[PDB]
Structure formats: structure tokens, C-alpha cells
From a paper:
The T4SS also elaborates a long extracellular filament—the conjugative pilus—that is essential for DNA transfer.
The IMC is 1.32 MDa in size and 295 Å in diameter. The IMC is composed of six protomers, each including one VirB3 (also known as TrwM), two VirB4, and the three N-terminal tails of VirB8 (hereafter referred to VirB8tails; VirB8 is also known as TrwG). Three of these protomers are occupied to a significant degree, whereas the occupancy of the three others is weaker. All protomers were related by an angle of 60°. In the IMC, six dimers of VirB4 come together to form a hexamer of dimers. The second subunit of the dimers (VirB4outside; structurally very similar to VirB4central) protrudes out (in cyan blue in Fig. 2). The arches (the composition and architecture of which were previously unknown) are composed of hexamers of homotrimeric units of VirB8peri, forming a 177 Å diameter ring around the stalk.
Author numbering:
A (entry chain B): 15 to 130, 147 to 236, 240 to 433, 441 to 503, 515 to 530, 606 to 764, 775 to 821
B (entry chain A): 147 to 243
C (entry chain A): 2 to 49
D (entry chain E): 12 to 58
E (entry chain D): 13 to 58
F (entry chain F): 22 to 58
The structure:
Amino acid sequence: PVGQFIPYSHHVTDTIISTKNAEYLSVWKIDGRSHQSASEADVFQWIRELNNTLRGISSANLSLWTHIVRRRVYEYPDAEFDNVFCRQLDEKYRESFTGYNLMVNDLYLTVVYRPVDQKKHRQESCIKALEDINRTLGQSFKRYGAELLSVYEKGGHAFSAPLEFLARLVNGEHIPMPICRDRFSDYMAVNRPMFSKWGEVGELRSLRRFGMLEIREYDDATEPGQLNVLLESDYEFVLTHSFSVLSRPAAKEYLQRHQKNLIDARDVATDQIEEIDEALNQLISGHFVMGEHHCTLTVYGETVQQVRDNLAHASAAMLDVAVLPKPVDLALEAGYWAQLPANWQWRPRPAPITSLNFLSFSPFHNFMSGKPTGNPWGPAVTILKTVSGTPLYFNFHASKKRLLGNTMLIGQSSSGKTVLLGFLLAQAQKFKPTIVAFDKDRGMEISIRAMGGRYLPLKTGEPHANLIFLKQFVKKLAAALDLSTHQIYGFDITEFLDNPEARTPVMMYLLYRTESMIDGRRFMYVFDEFWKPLQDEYFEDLAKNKQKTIRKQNGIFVFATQEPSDALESNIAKTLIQQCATYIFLANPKADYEDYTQGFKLTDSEFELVRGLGEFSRRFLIKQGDQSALAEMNLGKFRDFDDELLVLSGTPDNAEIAESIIAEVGDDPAVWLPIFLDRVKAERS
Amino acid sequence: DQKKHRQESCIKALEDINRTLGQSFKRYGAELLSVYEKGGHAFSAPLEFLARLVNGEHIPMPICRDRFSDYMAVNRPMFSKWGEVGELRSLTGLRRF
Amino acid sequence: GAIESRKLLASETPVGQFIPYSHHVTDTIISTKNAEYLSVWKIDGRSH
Amino acid sequence: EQLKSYYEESRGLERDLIGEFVKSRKTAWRVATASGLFGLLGMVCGI
Amino acid sequence: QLKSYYEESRGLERDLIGEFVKSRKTAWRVATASGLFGLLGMVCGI
Amino acid sequence: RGLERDLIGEFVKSRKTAWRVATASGLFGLLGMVCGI
């Protein structure tokens, strides 16, 4: 049947998949670096840094395949959660997304090794070859972020992660395949593609038909990335590159052969011969390896007419750059079967290409997209639009016990902090965690009262292991508490935020009940200003000590601060600042350049983007891990954004109206908001 | 080196011919198609005309290290057998000439 | 078939045989496989 | 539930497949050439 | 010491196991031809 | 199943062919001997 074309046999060492002809393989899922954020210098430096390990480990056995896949992600489930106001917000903001891209970019580089009693010892040598190759590749890809796919247990019979990607490459849809006693190529093809008799187009059944554009460029690329125009598009596709690195002796012979062939001609072109001779000279001195290369683009369209239109648009976009696609009318079968790693024979037209040109054609550049699903709490907490028209799937747990959860939001309170804080909290309600909130203002209280939990403002007139409580109480002497009542809580810090010394004792006592009540159920601590609590003598020490255990539990500290220079990154605050997983920087009209850049390790070009947002532009820079993007949760007409923005923002008049209505209603099924709806806008009008 | 001599003499003669023709066609349009660069990479305006002749549609032609002949054609021609017309198969459409 | 497609395309004749062109030797002049140098004039014709 | 002890042997299985297959090729030429010579004996005897 | 672009290309494209299968098929075919010559000799003798 | 079922599969399938060739050679040789004698 179709088992002829697929060569993989069985799984070895828990991280390599053996193959027919004894050719060990290893798959890496790479999250590309953000090309947009960085300047022009960083991209060249990244290309050269990759070339470092490429030529460093280069050998005739080595080879690499690169696949980029644009997936219409359905892994977002549109979960259900009981609150009414958050339901309104969720539904409207889902409605806002109509007509916008939901495609994501996934990049894969699969390193493959094909060597050209003592049989077992030679087998050990062969496997340790790929062992060292993977080790050096991992060390070289630390900044990029590389997850070596490996087996993962499931209910007593294992699944191998690498098989899933190689399946997706041929099946076209993510199908979980387990490790069974068979050979993998026997049954990994759940879906067999059917190609046309003449071969112009191909068909795949879920039906999605596909067509292929052959791309081959024989001269050096001007730009570090010439194919990034495709990263935004309305068509799913798979783009492939194979680099079977030739050994140097073969490279010399090929160059001499091509040089002589160009010499023997009726018309002599002095420019091309000089260029090829220069490349020959560079080969010994500029130590870049050459390998056979071929590039194929496999778009996806429901109907052949739509497929042809997508091909035409891709060709036009490519010809905007100086790359001319050659359409494939026949041998589409060979080209498509060339996609599977270790299928050397079916390559349509390999062409020896310098390593620098290969990296220029396929550098790991992709827009930020995060991980829509699989996060430790569940699906992505929320999805945010970005500039350049690509969707961003926001999740807190993104790090470099368990991944870090702490988040930093830096910006002025007026500059969109309120709406973003409220929207993120409302989305995070979908997992139903416990929330403890401290607000620099009375703004948070209306938002909290909208949710299930009732805010507990602090006002004048309303105030054995307990040895710790007594000893902390003595420290102050020197100068409905628990989570049983309801899930969510809010305690005003506006009373003691500006106070010189009243904040410390009440913070010390409150942390007791707050931490001790749940203690391992879940935690999503929120502080509007976290630099005010940290100036304590005792609180910061316990935070730094116990962050490890809190991280072990389902505990995330969503810190925040209006001014980072105000937080001044004191000696005690250093750990809290540095262990932040995801940073969201708002537009800061005033930002001390040196402290801002050096404290956050923010790149110079990223700082240029932050300044570019300037003042009073409702955009933010999200730097998760080691990549960045300019995401704006702008709220316009396509039209409830007006009202759920009106309630979300917190003002003293809104605060007093909220408290009076809550106290006076008695029983109100969040019907104060309809009262709150018009009772406010009348005053502003 | 003598092939280079033929190159140089032929280029001089052809340049002389073009200059004379341009001087003769003052009343006419008399525009000489030449290389035009766009986007950090060179392009060939004359190649576009020859492509239009051979492909039937105006396709811009970047100039690369390989020879012009190998990558000139992007449309599959299908000349009829025992017929007086032919068909070009292209992504934009099918053209019968 | 996959092997059948390969043996068919191996039989197939490329179109490059009938297109005798090569490098731009000069900015305005094109070469040829038989060293027949070429130049194209775009003429805006006279009104008749 | 020895997950990898079960494929700790698959490696040696692949090695043994390669060894048996190359050994079979060797004995294939061995038998073929023996038949060739002995059939030459028969054919020349008949001639 | 590959010393050949053509050798490297062939080594990439060639399938090892299929090569062994074809080699054994040729071996058996040649042996069959030998058996044919032997039977011809038997008939000639008879 | 898998490669192992292929391993034993050939491991005795080639037994069959080797035995068949050996029997054919034995038959031919005994034929020659008997006819000559």
C-alpha cells in the first residue's frame, strides 16, 4: 500500500526513531525567535551563531529538514464559566474576532544521522553520535527554545512524541499514535493522499486538496529572511527544506565541475564565473559547508479553484521578493513524498546550496503565538490581537517544580492598566482559581464585586503554630478572613500604600490567613503595587524563601507596579523581579532608559518599540520568555465594549455608587450593573 | 580570450547599432529596454518581453546566477497534434493561441 | 505511479531546448546559446 | 511495566536483521556460483 | 575520500535494503540460468 | 509483529529456499549418477 513511501521503523533510546537502512533520527520542535522586535544586527548575529554549531558538527552523515506549518487551530475550546458579566465580556470579545486570522506558526527541524561481535559496539557508537549531536544542538538553541520530543507515558502504554509530528506531516491532522510492537511506517498513515492522474493537484480526506509550488533559488539571498512574507497569509501550508551536507572533498569536485562547465560555452559571462570562483575561494576560508537543497511549498485549499487562487497569490507574494516559484504540474507525488524526513530519493531537484544561503532561506523567525493548549491549568487563558495581523494566545506559565507563573505589568494606571487587568482577571476566572487582590486605588472593587467574590475595602472604624502570629505581632508592638466565605477576595492597600509604617503589621497578619487558608489548592495572588509590601522587614524574607513551595503548588503571584524605577529593584525585591515568567510592558511616556533596560534585560530594539508606543496609545509589549510582540486588546465597535469598559474602570464616583448599590439592594442578581449602566454615563454626559 | 574578443567586438557593434537606431527614431518613441532593479535585487526588463512572448502573460523575471533559458518558462505549452491552435496551461488561466 | 511518474518525467523533454537565451552580457544586451547578442527596443509608434 | 527493557532488544533485533540479511546475500552468491560451475560441468559433459 | 559528486549523489539516492533484495534476485536468476545450462547438457548427453 | 516478525520470517523463509536449492542439487546429482551408472 502506502507503507512503501514511509521509511521509519521503530523507536530507540527514548529520543531517536530508527529507520529502514539503519538511519537514526531526532525531531526538535523549535519556537522561532521574534524577527520583528529585534533590529538588523541581531538577525545577522543569530544567523552566524547558528552557522557556528552547523559547521561545528557538520559531517557527511549529518542532515537537517525544516518544516513550517500554518495550522487553523481548533485546540481553543471556548470554555464555560458561570459568571454573568465575564460571560458578557467573553462573548462580545469572541464576536470581535470575526474576519481575523486564527492561524499559528509551528517550526520543526529534524536532525537525522545516516552512517555510511563488534556490531553492538558499532551500534553504540552510532547512537552516541546522535546523542552528541542532540546535546550540542540543544546547547546552541538555548535562546530559541527547543523541545526535544520524546516518549511520554499514558495510562500504561507509551506514546512517542516525535511520531506525532511525522504523522502530521503526512496525515495533515494531529492524530495521536501510540508505540506498538509493530514497525511505525506500517500504520502511521491513517490518511492516504490521493493525487490526480495527470498529477496537477492532490486530494486529502478528513476534504482538503493541496497544490505544490516548487521554489529553487541558485544565488545568494540579500536579506536574512526572504520568506517571512508567507508568515501572514490566508492559506495553510507546509514549507520544506532538506540539507544533506556534502563532505568537503565532494564540494571541491562539484565546484570544479560547474566552473569548467560554465567555462565551456559559446558566450563567456565574466561576472558569473568570477562569482563562482570567489565562492570557491571562500569555501576553504569562510568555513561554511555546502549541501544538497530543495524547497517545496504545499498550500491547502478546500476547492481546486481556491487552491489555484492561493497558488497565484503565493507566487505574486514571492515575486514581490526576487524569488520565482516554479509550479509543479507533474511529479507532485515525488515532491510531496519528499517532505517526510529521511526520504532523500524522492527529492525533485536537489541543488548544492551554501550554508549561509540555507540559513537565510530558513531562519527560525515566527511571530509570537505561545501555546494555545496543554498549559498546566488548561487551554490558553486568553487570546489577544497583535500588530502584523497574527493572533496571540496568552498564557501565564512560560518560563526558561513547575514553570514560573509570576507576571509583571509595567505602565501608568491611566495607560490601559485598568482594562487589561480586569480583562485578564475575567478570562482567568474560566479556570475558577482563588484570587487575592490588593489595589492601589478603589478601582479594583467594582470589578471584583462584578465577579463572584465580594471585595473587602479597608476603612476607618472597621478592623502551637500561632507562635509565629504572636512573634510577628510583637514586631508591630515594637513600632471572614479565611477563604471559606467565598472564592475571590480583595483587600484595599490604598489605605496604607502611602502610609510610612502602618502597612507592615497588617500585611504580616493578613498573609497568615491568606496563605494558610488554601495552602496548595490554588493561588493567583494579585498586587496592584508590590513594591509597597516588599519594604517590610519580614514579609520579603518569607516570600523569597517560600516562593519555591508556592511554585510547587498551583500558586502564581501576578505582581504589578505602576513605575518600575519606583520599585527601584531593591536587594530584597531582586528575586521577585527576576523570577517573573511573562512581562507585559505598557506604553510608558517616561521611562529611565538605563534602569528600564538593565533591570528587565530588555533589548535595545525592544526599548525602541516601547518608546515608539509613546504615550496614550493602547498597545502593550508582551515579552514571554525570549520573544516579543506588540499586542493590543483594543475595544471598538465590532458593540458592548463601551459598557464593559465603563464598568471595568474604577473611579471614586463609580466606587461610591458600587458600594451604595451593593449595601442598599440586599438581594441583587448582579442587577446593580444595569442600574450601574446608565446611572454613571448620565453624570459624565 | 578570442571568445572574449568576439564578445567585445559584437558588443561594440551592437551598441553602435542601437545608438544609430535611437538617433533615427527621434519622432518615434525610441525607448531602449534595460535592467531595472527593485527590492535589493536586480531585474531584467527585456526578459519580461521575451517571457510575454513565450509565456503569454507578463511575468517579472528576476536575474539569478543560473542561465536565462532554464527558468524562463513557467507555463506548460501544449501544442495540438493535427491542429492549428495550441493551449498554454497557467495558474492564472488556460490560454488558447 | 510514483516510480511511473519518475520514469515519465525522465522521458519528458524540457522546453529549455527551444529558448536560446543566457546571461545579460550588458545592461541593455542579452546573450544567446549561439553567441547571437540581442537588444530589445520599446517603441512608442508614430501617429498615422 | 519495563517501558524500555522491551525496546532495549529492538536495537539488537535490527542489528541481527542486518547481519542475517547480508549473510543470506553471501550464501546466495555461494550457492549461485556453485550451481554455475556444476552446471558448466554438466553442459560440457553433454557437449 | 569520496572523491566524486556522482558517488555522493548515488549514495544518497540509493536504498540499501532494496539494493540487497535486487542483488539476491539477480543471484537466483543467474543460478536458474546455470540450471538451464545443466539441463541442456543432460539432454545433449542423452 | 513488527521487524521481529520480519526477522524470523526471513530467518526461516530463506531456510525454505536454501533447502529447496539443496534438494534440487541433490536430485540433479543423483540423476546424473544413476543415469551414468
